Amino acid sequence: KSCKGRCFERTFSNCRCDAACVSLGNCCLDFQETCVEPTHIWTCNKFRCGEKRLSRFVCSCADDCKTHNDCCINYSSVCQDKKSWVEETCESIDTPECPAEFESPPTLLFSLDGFRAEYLHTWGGLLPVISKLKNCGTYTKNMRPMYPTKTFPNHYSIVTGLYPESHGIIDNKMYDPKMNASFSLKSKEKFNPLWYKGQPIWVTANHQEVKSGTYFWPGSDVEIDGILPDIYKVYNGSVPFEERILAVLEWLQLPSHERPHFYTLYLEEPDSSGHSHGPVSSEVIKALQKVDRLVGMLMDGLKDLGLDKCLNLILISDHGMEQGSCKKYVYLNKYLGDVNNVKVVYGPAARLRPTDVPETYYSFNYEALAKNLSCREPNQHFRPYLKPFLPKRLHFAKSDRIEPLTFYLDPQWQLALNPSERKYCGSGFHGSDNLFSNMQALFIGYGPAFKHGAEVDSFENIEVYNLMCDLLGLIPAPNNGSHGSLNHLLKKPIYNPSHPKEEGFLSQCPIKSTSNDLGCTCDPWIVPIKDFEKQLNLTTEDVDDIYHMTVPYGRPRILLKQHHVCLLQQQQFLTGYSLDLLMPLWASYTFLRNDQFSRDDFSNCLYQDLRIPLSPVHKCSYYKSNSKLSYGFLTPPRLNRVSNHIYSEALLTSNIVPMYQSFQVIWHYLHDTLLQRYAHERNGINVVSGPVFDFDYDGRYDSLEILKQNSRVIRSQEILIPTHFFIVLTSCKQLSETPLECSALESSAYILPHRPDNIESCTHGKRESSWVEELLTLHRARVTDVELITGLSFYQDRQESVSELLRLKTHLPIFS
Amino acid sequence: KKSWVEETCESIDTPECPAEFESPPTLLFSLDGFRAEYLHTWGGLLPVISKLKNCGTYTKNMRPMYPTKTFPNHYSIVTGLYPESHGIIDNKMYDPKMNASFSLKSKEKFNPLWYKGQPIWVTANHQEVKSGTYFWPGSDVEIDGILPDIYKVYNGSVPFEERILAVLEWLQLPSHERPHFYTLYLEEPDSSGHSHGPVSSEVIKALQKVDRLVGMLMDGLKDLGLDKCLNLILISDHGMEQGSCKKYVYLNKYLGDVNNVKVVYGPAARLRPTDVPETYYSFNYEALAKNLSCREPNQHFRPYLKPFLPKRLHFAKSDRIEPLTFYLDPQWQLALNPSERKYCGSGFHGSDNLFSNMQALFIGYGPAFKHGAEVDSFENIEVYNLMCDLLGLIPAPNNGSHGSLNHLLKKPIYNPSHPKEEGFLSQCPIKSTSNDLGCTCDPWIVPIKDFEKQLNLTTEDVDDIYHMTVPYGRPRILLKQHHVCLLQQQQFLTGYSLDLLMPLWASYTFLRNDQFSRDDFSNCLYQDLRIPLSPVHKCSYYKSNSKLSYGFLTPPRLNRVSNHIYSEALLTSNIVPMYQSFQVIWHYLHDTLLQRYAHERNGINVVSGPVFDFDYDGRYDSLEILKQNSRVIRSQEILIPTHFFIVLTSCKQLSETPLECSALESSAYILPHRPDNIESCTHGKRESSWVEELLTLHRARVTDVELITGLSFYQDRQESVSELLRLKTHLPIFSQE
Numbered sequence A: 001k002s003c004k005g006r007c008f009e010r011t012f013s014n015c016r017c018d019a020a021c022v023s024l025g026n027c028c029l030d031f032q033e034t035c036v037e038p039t040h041i042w043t044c045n046k047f048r049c050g051e052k053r054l055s056r057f058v059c060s061c062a063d064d065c066k067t068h069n070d071c072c073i074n075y076s077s078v079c080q081d082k083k084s085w086v087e088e089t090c091e092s093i094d095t096p097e098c099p100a101e102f103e104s105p106p107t108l109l110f111s112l113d114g115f116r117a118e119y120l121h122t123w124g125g126l127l128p129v130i131s132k133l134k135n136c137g138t139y140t141k142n143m144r145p146m147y148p149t150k151t152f153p154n155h156y157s158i159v160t161g162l163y164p165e166s167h168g169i170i171d172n173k174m175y176d177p178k179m180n181a182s183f184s185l186k187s188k189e190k191f192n193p194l195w196y197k198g199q200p201i202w203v204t205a206n207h208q209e210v211k212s213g214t215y216f217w218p219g220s221d222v223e224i225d226g227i228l229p230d231i232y233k234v235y236n237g238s239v240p241f242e243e244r245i246l247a248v249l250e251w252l253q254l255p256s257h258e259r260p261h262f263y264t265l266y267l268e269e270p271d272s273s274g275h276s277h278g279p280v281s282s283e284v285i286k287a288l289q290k291v292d293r294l295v296g297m298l299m300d301g302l303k304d305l306g307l308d309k310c311l312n313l314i315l316i317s318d319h320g321m322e323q324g325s326c327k328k329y330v331y332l333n334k335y336l337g338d339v340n341n342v343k344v345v346y347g348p349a350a351r352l353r354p355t356d357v358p359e360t361y362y363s364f365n366y367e368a369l370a371k372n373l374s375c376r377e378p379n380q381h382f383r384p385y386l387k388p389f390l391p392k393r394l395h396f397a398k399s400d401r402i403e404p405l406t407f408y409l410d411p412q413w414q415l416a417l418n419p420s421e422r423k424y425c426g427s428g429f430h431g432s433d434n435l436f437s438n439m440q441a442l443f444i445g446y447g448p449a450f451k452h453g454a455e456v457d458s459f460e461n462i463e464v465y466n467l468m469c470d471l472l473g474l475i476p477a478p479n480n481g482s483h484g485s486l487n488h489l490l491k492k493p494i495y496n497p498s499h500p501k502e503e504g505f506l507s508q509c510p511i512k513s514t515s516n517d518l519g520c521t522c523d524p525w526i527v528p529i530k531d532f533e534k535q536l537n538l539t540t541e542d543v544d545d546i547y548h549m550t551v552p553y554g555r556p557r558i559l560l561k562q563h564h565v566c567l568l569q570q571q572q573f574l575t576g577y578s579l580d581l582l583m584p585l586w587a588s589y590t591f592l593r594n595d596q597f598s599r600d601d602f603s604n605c606l607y608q609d610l611r612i613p614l615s616p617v618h619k620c621s622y623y624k625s626n627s628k629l630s631y632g633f634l635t636p637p638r639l640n641r642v643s644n645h646i647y648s649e650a651l652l653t654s655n656i657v658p659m660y661q662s663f664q665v666i667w668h669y670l671h672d673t674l675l676q677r678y679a680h681e682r683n684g685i686n687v688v689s690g691p692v693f694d695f696d697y698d699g700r701y702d703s704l705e706i707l708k709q710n711s712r713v714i715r716s717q718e719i720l721i722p723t724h725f726f727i728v729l730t731s732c733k734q735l736s737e738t739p740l741e742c743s744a745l746e747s748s749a750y751i752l753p754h755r756p757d758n759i760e761s762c763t764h765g766k767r768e769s770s771w772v773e774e775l776l777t778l779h780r781a782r783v784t785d786v787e788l789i790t791g792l793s794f795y796q797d798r799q800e801s802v803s804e805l806l807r808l809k810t811h812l813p814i815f816s
Numbered sequence B: 001k002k003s004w005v006e007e008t009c010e011s012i013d014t015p016e017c018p019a020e021f022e023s024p025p026t027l028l029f030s031l032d033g034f035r036a037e038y039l040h041t042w043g044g045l046l047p048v049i050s051k052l053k054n055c056g057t058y059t060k061n062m063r064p065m066y067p068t069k070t071f072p073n074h075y076s077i078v079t080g081l082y083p084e085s086h087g088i089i090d091n092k093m094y095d096p097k098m099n100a101s102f103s104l105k106s107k108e109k110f111n112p113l114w115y116k117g118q119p120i121w122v123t124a125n126h127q128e129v130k131s132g133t134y135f136w137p138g139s140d141v142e143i144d145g146i147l148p149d150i151y152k153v154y155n156g157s158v159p160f161e162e163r164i165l166a167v168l169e170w171l172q173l174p175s176h177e178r179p180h181f182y183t184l185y186l187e188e189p190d191s192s193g194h195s196h197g198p199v200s201s202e203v204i205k206a207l208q209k210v211d212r213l214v215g216m217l218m219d220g221l222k223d224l225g226l227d228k229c230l231n232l233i234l235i236s237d238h239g240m241e242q243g244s245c246k247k248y249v250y251l252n253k254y255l256g257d258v259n260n261v262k263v264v265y266g267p268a269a270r271l272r273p274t275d276v277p278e279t280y281y282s283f284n285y286e287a288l289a290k291n292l293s294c295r296e297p298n299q300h301f302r303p304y305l306k307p308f309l310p311k312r313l314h315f316a317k318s319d320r321i322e323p324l325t326f327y328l329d330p331q332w333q334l335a336l337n338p339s340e341r342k343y344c345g346s347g348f349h350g351s352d353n354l355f356s357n358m359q360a361l362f363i364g365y366g367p368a369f370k371h372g373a374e375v376d377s378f379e380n381i382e383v384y385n386l387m388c389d390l391l392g393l394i395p396a397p398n399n400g401s402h403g404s405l406n407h408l409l410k411k412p413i414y415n416p417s418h419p420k421e422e423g424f425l426s427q428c429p430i431k432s433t434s435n436d437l438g439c440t441c442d443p444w445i446v447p448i449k450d451f452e453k454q455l456n457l458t459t460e461d462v463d464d465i466y467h468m469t470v471p472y473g474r475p476r477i478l479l480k481q482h483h484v485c486l487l488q489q490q491q492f493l494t495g496y497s498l499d500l501l502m503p504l505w506a507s508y509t510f511l512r513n514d515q516f517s518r519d520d521f522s523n524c525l526y527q528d529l530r531i532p533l534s535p536v537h538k539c540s541y542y543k544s545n546s547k548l549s550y551g552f553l554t555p556p557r558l559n560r561v562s563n564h565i566y567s568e569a570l571l572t573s574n575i576v577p578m579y580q581s582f583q584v585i586w587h588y589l590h591d592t593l594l595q596r597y598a599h600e601r602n603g604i605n606v607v608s609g610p611v612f613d614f615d616y617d618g619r620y621d622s623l624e625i626l627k628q629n630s631r632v633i634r635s636q637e638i639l640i641p642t643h644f645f646i647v648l649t650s651c652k653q654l655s656e657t658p659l660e661c662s663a664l665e666s667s668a669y670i671l672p673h674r675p676d677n678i679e680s681c682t683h684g685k686r687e688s689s690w691v692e693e694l695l696t697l698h699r700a701r702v703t704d705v706e707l708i709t710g711l712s713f714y715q716d717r718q719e720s721v722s723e724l725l726r727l728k729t730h731l732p733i734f735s736q737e
Ligand SMILES: *[C@@H]1O[C@H](CO)[C@@H](O[C@@H]2O[C@H](CO)[C@@H](O[C@@H]3O[C@H](CO[C@H]4O[C@H](CO)[C@@H](O)[C@H](O)[C@@H]4O)[C@@H](O)[C@H](O[C@H]4O[C@H](CO)[C@@H](O)[C@H](O)[C@@H]4O)[C@@H]3O)[C@H](O)[C@H]2NC(C)=O)[C@H](O)[C@H]1NC(C)=O
Pocket: A162, A163, A166, A167, A197, A198, A478, A479, A480, A698, A699, A700, A788
């Protein structure tokens, strides 16, 4: 006989089933796989179907296991001869297998709050359902959230495609000076439409006659354009997760004239366990597994309705999670004392404003305060920023809702006004720089639209608005996502993106102007040979040769609406010169690995470009011992190896720009030591440098109206000082190819703030190698970020498709 | 029917055994590489081990021995000995006197000559107690020509369930065949730790796997009516750490590709030359060690000649240990080149046994161990004695302080005693007549005879100077025959060796409000008339002496009554020989640090003194050995301390000064006395940084000091001996975070 139904029970029969049988040799021959191996295996087998229920077992195959919800993975397959969704081998859904009632597969946006990308990297092997969606769907190791990395801003960005600065919800707590009211999830203000700007996707769907069923989502229980989703629930976090899923499974079974084509679904885990117990806790592993089973519940649900090959699922997260520490909490009362005149939004992305509402608010002198708090301590883990001086990549300035004074915290650090304001400091948190690795987010696309088993590089969550529009078949509202940049996630792209066209025609700068005295004493070192003037008759039509050497990927295209531009060709660079501003908009050149460039001194030597109008600010006299500002070169002076003298063309008046002395430190180091290194390390490097004007800090190139207003007079001469300086490095992926012959491109891009001091960098004690390189890295940006803020368009002549180039251009590296 | 894990906690005050069992046996259950932290973080995924913890006696960390490897620690647990003593110093090792190498994969594994000391099953055998070891290091070997009564030759392929069923069956054997001691050994979570790293899915799985097997056993014992009649020690050998190819040091960078040296790769790497064993002793490791010292700005490895490793590690006294060892920073590892090392991405261990992630698991559950008691960290060598007390065995001589774990037990078997004095407490009458020491003292300084006349005014109050100096009892001299005076002064008590003409210890109390003088006191000594005048007590001897200087065991800047310098501190009985370079360390420690600790702890009590361990066996040197290591410096015979010890003590309650503690707080250090400071690679650094780092590295147990000096502290304290044995054996964990 067997031990079935007799495990550790009785002895009378010829063979025993109790622990005494091993010493005696009395064991029934299945005692091991009937009563012992179930004590520490989690998987059913032929011996266990219809077993006696025992507590000792990890996992049950007893018939009564369905009621208690403790069956094994394979209780369905082994003991009931049919499988769960998770168990079925991967299959390629090239065309959607739908029921006859369904005219096309709907999309479901399933959000797991605080599911940091890393959870799946590390704990993937404890999460077979989500792992199957990943392996059978389209995955990315990181999806970049928006700053601040909080729940409301990001959830609303996903469904709008907008930056928080634009869509209105900049944090779960915020105050508006023009409404004179505060926003809070716990408040009634939550349901006031005036907060939620932009167009959410369900409103987009409504305007184009597509139904929507949102179980939970930020915004969906609000009349945004006087429009709610067709089905929707007012937020109540107490509603068990299973109800949430059953309810959407039921909405899917509704008749077609009642049935949504778009769905959302939202769970508060693993976020909740993330705060209470931290991201490396037992409680999070439990929350993770809990949520994996609920994603499984849904998949079986869809499998039971014959929809599991007829649904486009985006499984997604708002932000990641990080471990807090009472040892990594900054309190301002230390530098300020206990003060009553300021409110601080505590956290890693802390913001500050004065108490008076809103009379004191604008004229409070935040500059003074910000300076007070700057560089107080040796390795300060917080840095005060007036919001237009935050990094442009964060896109966190253009809103009254955002306070004038913000704080940037180092990873793991948080700020409050004092110990009483903050939450408990030992908790998990989020909100930090959206490029920190632990703030990265989850994205898996699975369905008949998404490629199977495709892994892709990180993209920002604002790109998803357009994707869901393409999936639902909707014309997207204007957003900050580059339409078509995610085509590589899809089997068959709906949208084919185009390069933007140049607005106008270009003007001619011919060599006309007569030489004036610029008032420069040039060294004997410099080589302005009489013949130099000939060089000015070089044109771009000097096909490739020098033209290709300067702009091998195509020349930047001017998108500025009406803006008079010359293309000035030189031997080793090409300048795009604005006649409107009498200033170069960009210079483009290629530093080959073997190229040298001289550290001879070129103080006070300028060469009047005869092709352009002579401004009083092109003259050396203007800067001669000028304490207020100086000038800089968009292309460094480089050496002619055969003569061993410098290319004078770099000293042309069309190659200079206004530049604070302090910034020159950054600009010098970048060119003197760094650009040489990158050239060496990448087998050559291609540069496009240029000034930037974003005085309204809206992240986009300034109107000519706005430029007028921000011109200033310095030596009784009108001059316009760049808000930032941009640079776009480009080289081949294959180190065997120089930038003039890349098969595929590698792109870095920066938008360096142009500030008249360097307090941002707290230089005292440091070395330039340390602090300048740190500053570049902090102000790293997307190529697209440059494009938006300058009105230029790169890489247009490249053989690659536009959607390919849109990936290259929207990319940004993750920190750590 | 409930399983064991399911049943409510119950207090087993007396063991409920079957009639066949006359007393509860003990089972030593080892989970390899189960780092203490696994239970801290993943406890809520481990209900069985969590129940044992909550219903038993737990410690958040059990300190393993250095190096934190599998064989050394497993054998230390069952011996109570340091690896330097018990012979197994690593899983791979070479002996010059046997001219053979030891390897787990080798046949040498079974050679008895490697396994020194007495394992507990051999102890049991000698005292007629049977033993069943399922797996353990040593147990498949004839140590004293003795094997355990039941034993298995190691085979890691044997499934874990067989291992447990087999012990459960041995428990059911007839009493004349049945073991009273059992071991049981699993290779997880260690294996998953290496392959996939601590903090991987695979480790969580391994952890849960092992939790269920501990559960299998508990149900097993519950089915035999033994689950209230068994003393279980659930234990681990060491912890685990994540490796990285970015944190691997390769010596070929500084040496080139050389064929004349072998390196044991890892975090506790050791080096010896290839020739076996002709080149081995006369290779000049000094030169090499210096070559490799301070080569790079934040070097994460540091070469050590093995007697200069920290004394707390107890890792020098063995031929098996190579002359040149390396100390690595947390997470770092060293090899000769990329080819020697294992794959660098793996998990590893072996690092400093005070790193947090090397800490180990210990849970005691049974009718002997308190239920739901959490205790402070202890070292695994303490377990030998505990298991002797549990099995009822007289323990072989080990390095564990017998009785220091009594607080883990409901009813202690052993009541420890303070060791009695054996040195010869001789008189020192004030007899010596004043010679010229050749010191030009400043006018600033106050002379000695006046010092009492000076003394009365502002100083009148009645209070006790003996208690003010040694409030916890005076150190007791355990040195076998050693002539000692107790020299009383106003603010300190010096225990003065007449044999060495040198103070063995000075004891004093720096009260929070004690004034600290800023006066300059160069070249001023006061001949103590109570002691014999040595030529080495004279200032002239050190006058512009480049070779060495002297130092004070009690700072002269410390002074209760005034802004002036304490004259009694400049007595010739308060000085010791001291390299100029070490003075940097010693000055900072007293000028800035001691003041701070005094402030931060509402006063501080100090006991400083020299140390002589020339044979580097961790114990006070024989007078024979001291003779041999004497040297002549200014044509004068002098013996230079190998280390300097210091023992700080203050109250736990900050409201109490050290003279009135209810409970004590103890730090202790054994600072190496080296003639340069290359250990600290000072260039570029500040003293605050590098001196404080050095103290921390050379922190030690109070007991470590006791062993190496022959002194015995805190004897007059009201607390029991076993209480004080906790205080004395304690050491802080280096927190990673
Ligand atoms: C991220 O993506 C979003 C959307 O794609 C972009 O946000 C838009 O940005 C533009 C420019 O900042 C905004 O356009 C401006 O809107 C203002 C308000 O418009 C309403 O209110 C006025 C009443 O004052 C109504 O009359 C009008 O019909 C609107 O209902 C206007 O004040 C601005 O007008 C200016 O430009 C026009 C050109 O048409 C001039 O003729 C005017 O004189 C004036 O100077 C302008 O229209 C738009 O509001 C933003 N939309 C949203 C949703 O935020 C972000 O720019 C983008 N960020 C990126 C890519 O970095």
